[PDB]
Subunit: 103 residues, 3 copies
């Protein structure tokens, strides 16, 4: 089993959270245009996921911690149900993050 | 005191500048959609700041140097007046940059 | 001659390709909003190029490999004809990539 299907160093960062309900670690994150806060990636756009949640959230925190770089194992991330496969594969394209098979 | 409230290596890069007036070092930068040039981050959108000015500018340079990665100390950056706090904290979300308390 | 006009480590990543015709290595890439697939950077927007093709493509592959970080030599990249100079220089602004003269 794995999480970091890569050698390129994984770094973390903090940011204002806009998540209200409980969300588990390893959930892709995106920015909420209206508020500028981080929330779960909705899977609507490739390149929109700008981070991966490090630790799980209750849904009441004002801040959160996420991975801003690194190569992750696709199978370890909590993807939104029914997400488009192409947008999934290119979810982090543009950031320092990326993902692939374990193997 | 500090500037690099982080261990993740800070790297720099160059790019076409669209700044006309004098601007001090450590000023967040954003891209100008109309021209594709780099200018001061206006604070209107989280994730829009794509770099931090390394050296100060006169306002007549055609090119500029900025940090494209690293973890900076929030207090060292010249933020735009009255910027929204959430958009401030997530200013660089999406890039290789990030910031936090000194501390 | 060179390719990596920089010391900051070059890392790669994979993603769904939307390229149909043959394209050579070192071609800037961008995301296709409609599909979420990666295609050649059209040069219309600075900060839109999110990667550089590692190996050449036939135009029938469903996946591709690209550099997601590093500092490249401008002269080694296959730029789109007549691209605007400012959008060229700031092509990767926002990602972990960047480019400059060899020297």
């Amino acid at each position: 089993v794995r999480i970091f299907a890569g050698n390129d160093p994984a770094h973390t960062a903090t940011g204002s959270s806009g998540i209200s309900s409980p969300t588990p670690a390893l959930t892709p994150l995106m920015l909420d245009e209206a508020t500028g806060k981080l929330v779960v990636w909705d899977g609507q756009k490739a390149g929109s996921a700008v981070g991966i949640l490090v630790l799980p959230l209750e849904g009441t925190e004002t801040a959160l911690t996420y991975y801003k770089s690194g190569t992750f194992a696709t199978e370890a991330i909590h993807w939104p149900e029914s997400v488009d496969e192409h947008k999934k594969a290119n979810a982090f394209a543009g950031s320092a993050l990326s993902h692939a098979a374990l193997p």
